[PDB]
């Protein structure tokens, strides 16, 4: 079940979307985060994404709704392609490995300022074989909660 550590981590993640700190993520905020990741949704696709997670139907996502979404899990059968595309946003040089440098660049473009200690830790926790990098297989497992 949801650990307290995961809750604080998810609250941190929540703040990457909730730019203005008003406690809700709007389509505008979702749009700017997606664009920072090289994605380009239309105002309509942005609305569908919010509506899939919007529980009380008020058009925006508050922390409980985000936590709920984040809390839940699915198998790798759940669009391996989405995972593939996400991997590609990190693996900027296309070599098949996410380096600490690549992880840092992505985070910075997202507006998250990590030190060296934090980047290595994020890497260390996803790294299975111990080479200090995250390959696609390691990435998949991080995502599929297994």
Ligand X SMILES: CN1CCN(CCCN2c3ccccc3Sc3ccc(C(F)(F)F)cc32)CC1
Binding residues for Ca(2+): 18, 20, 22, 24, 29, 54, 56, 58, 60, 65, 91, 93, 95, 97, 102, 127, 129, 131, 133, 138
Which partner in Ca ion, ligand X, none is near 100 (CB below 5 to 8 A by kind)?
A: none
CB contact set of 38 (below 8 Å; sequence gap of 6+): 89
CA distance 97 to 99: 6
| 125 contributes a contact to ligand X by CB under 6 A | yes
Parallel/antiparallel/unpaired status of strands 61-62 and 97-98: unpaired
8-state DSSP, 65: H
Residues 107-146: x where in contact with Ca ion by CB under 5 A, - otherwise, as a string: --------------------x-x-x-x-------------
Neighbours of 100 (CB within 10 A): 19
Q: Length of the chain in residues, anyone?
A: 146
Q: Is 30 in the site for Ca ion (CB under 5 A)?
A: no
Assign 3-state DSSP to the chain and report helix, strand, coil percentages, each to 5: 60, 5, 35
Name the phi and psi angles at 34, rounded to 5. -65, -40
State yes or no: residue 18 binds Ca ion (CB under 5 A): yes
Binding residues for Ca ion, per CB under 5 A? 18, 20, 22, 24, 54, 56, 58, 91, 93, 95, 97, 127, 129, 131, 133
Binding residues for ligand X, per CB under 6 A? 9, 12-13, 16-17, 25, 30, 49-50, 52-53, 61, 66, 69-70, 73, 86, 90, 98, 103, 107, 112-114, 118, 121-123, 125-126, 134, 139, 142-143, 145
């Amino acid at each position: 079940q949801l650990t307290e550590e995961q809750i604080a981590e998810f609250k941190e993640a929540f703040s990457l979307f909730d730019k203005d700190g008003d406690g809700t993520i709007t389509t505008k905020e979702l749009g700017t985060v997606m664009r920072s990741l090289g994605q380009n949704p239309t105002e309509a696709e942005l609305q569908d994404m919010i509506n899939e997670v919007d529980a009380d139907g008020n058009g925006t996502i508050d922390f409980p709704e985000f936590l709920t979404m984040m809390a839940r899990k699915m198998k790798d059968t759940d669009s391996e392609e989405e995972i593939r595309e996400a991997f590609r946003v990190f693996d900027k040089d296309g070599n098949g490995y996410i380096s600490a440098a690549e992880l840092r660049h992505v985070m910075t473009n997202l507006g998250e300022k990590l030190t060296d200690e934090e980047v290595d830790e994020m890497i260390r926790e996803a790294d299975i074989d111990g080479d200090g990098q995250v390959n696609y297989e390691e990435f998949v497992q991080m995502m599929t909660a297994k």
